[PDB]
Amino acid sequence: AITVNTNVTSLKAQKNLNTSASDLATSMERLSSGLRINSAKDDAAGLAISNRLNS
């Protein structure tokens, strides 16, 4: 069909572009900080193990 009111290819392209931008921002943060684990989003058990090793 040739339709004007809905465009699905654009929706899917938007979602892919957003995923790529998120990944790039995460990498930029990790290079700026120098650490792999900046939150518990990253690795939760490693966070606690590293707190104990830090103590």
């Binding site: 069909a1 040739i2 339709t3 004007v4 009111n5 809905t6 699905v8 929706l11 899917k12 979602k15």
Partner: protein, 54 residues
Amino acid sequence: ANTQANVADAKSRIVDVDFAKETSQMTKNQVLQQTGSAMLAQANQLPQVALSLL
């Protein structure tokens, strides 16, 4: 996000118009209008045979 894309596709299949089909129907009805107008104008001149017989 995935499900929104697929459901909007599904809805578009039901609600939206097809331009390739609808333009063809429009042109067909245009030509039929011109033909029917000509034929009706020619049809309103039939009672004039009586003036010839008269």
